[PDB]
């Protein structure tokens, strides 16, 4: 429901003003599993008809499950201890965009191994 | 372990962007200088997602050899990639980038001015500040709430 | 449609989502007044807005945006660069078939691929000796394309 | 013949508007959609004729390309060419067309209008009924018998 764009640039303007040198690497974590997540689909796309090493590939997909899921631990943990209804709403909206990322990240991994 | 840097060199002219996408990153967390050229030729990479993990990648070396093909990447088609070239010219902290920044502030995607402008701040200088007041007493909008707090904070 | 003046005002919004559906909408309406705003629209700054564009203007039909979307072939993207070859083989305009067939040194396979399936849509005596040299010399999709292309096309 | 095709597309370029005329017309008889956008380029042609003709040929042959260009046909300063420009979109049937064709309700010439109106039957749908009641409520002449009669008979 929420641009990645909108929900970059309110995270944006909570890092003005504010001492917290994690929000910058939840910004660009958020940003580059996102990303990630495009490029996987295109990747399959590129597969055509399904037309993949095992262990070494499978390792560079497999380690990007633990980091949306760390990610996605990180902003709740975030939405649990801010009391801005604004910063609140923030946070929820990334975790609705990463919450989409994740489940699409694991069904293209599969395809792609 | 040394190897590790010639085998991701390699991958980035792989035929797969997410193959030339998995080195560039890998390249970043390792540090290697070897791998300050390679990835300043990923810069041109026809994927957008390579060359913007190549940019955050040349972010993380700090080698200034990167300065001045990270500020040719501010006038590249993607805003993601302006941004992230934008990061890494403020890590690198080289004041060869603080007029192409200035002039990125014009730029018509909001994220971009807002990494351009928090680029400058990190960079520092008396050509930074002078920016900052300009943007302090006639701008508007995040441009203006990130530029006083430039003089509330830095100086 | 009647929708047309809010969705061309809105490809110069500032959320890259909001810019991407008003070019899909601006493709399904039909409308000519569309089609200059979406031709600048090839060079947004956000290459998936490009992407739905491109696509667009293959929709719509117009012949007024196949000079355009000929120049998208040399867009620093690849994603942007397949979904012009689309457009074009979609309309099928004659002056696409030699930009077409120099897409076929593309890099990027995806680029060949949908250059070979335009050049096979538009047709005519010029596309079949791409297609000969490309059941000869071609790999991949490409080569594919170009296979079945003489198989069922004759002389 | 595939042959007799290529032969017509290189005479919509005849200096006689005579040749221009009869390899339009006879592109339409065959039906070969290799001519759809040779027959769009015509649909500028400096003799009213081949216009006509233009517009006639792309509505037998039914290819949904055509459907843009001949809308901006129902503004051309002939009368003949914007009549038959509305019946062959109303042979595409593509839903595209319905919106301009209400618009072209209110033409200046009586004919152009009576087959506007039949192109928005044969098109069919909840927006042409809606158009349909309109001219039902606050038509007169012709146009509000045609309209009273669809009401009566659910087309």
């Known amino acids: 429901v929420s641009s990645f764009q909108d929900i970059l640039m309110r995270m944006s303007k909570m890092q003005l003003g504010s001492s917290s040198e994690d929000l910058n690497g939840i910004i660009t974590q958020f940003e580059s599993l996102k990303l990630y997540r495009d490029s996987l689909g295109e990747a399959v796309m590129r597969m055509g008809d399904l037309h993949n090493r095992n262990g070494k590939w499978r390792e560079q997909l497999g380690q990007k499950f633990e980091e949306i899921r760390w990610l996605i631990e990180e902003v709740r943990h975030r939405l649990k201890i801010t009391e801005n209804s604004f910063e609140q709403i923030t946070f929820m909206q990334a975790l609705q965009l990463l919450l989409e990322v994740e489940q699409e990240i694991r069904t293209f991994s599969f395809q792609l191994i | 372990d040394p190897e590790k840097v010639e085998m991701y060199i390699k991958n980035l002219q792989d035929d797969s962007p997410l193959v030339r996408d998995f080195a560039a990153n890998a390249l970043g967390k390792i540090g290697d200088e070897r791998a300050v050229e390679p990835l300043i030729k990923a810069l041109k990479d026809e994927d957008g997602y390579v060359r913007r993990t190549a940019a955050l990648a040349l972010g993380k070396i700090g080698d200034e050899r990167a300065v001045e093909p990270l500020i040719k990447a501010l006038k590249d088609e993607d ?68 530029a006083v707090n430039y003089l509330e904070t830095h100086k």
């Open chain 2, 79 to 146: 805003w993601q990639v302006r941004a992230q070239a934008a990061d890494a010219l403020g890590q690198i902290g080289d004041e060869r980038a603080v007029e192409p920044l200035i002039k990125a502030l014009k730029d018509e995607d909001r994220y971009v001015r807002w990494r351009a402008a928090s680029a400058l701040g990190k960079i520092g200088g008396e050509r930074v500040r002078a920016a900052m007041e300009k943007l302090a007493e006639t701008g508007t909008g995040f441009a203006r709430k990130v």
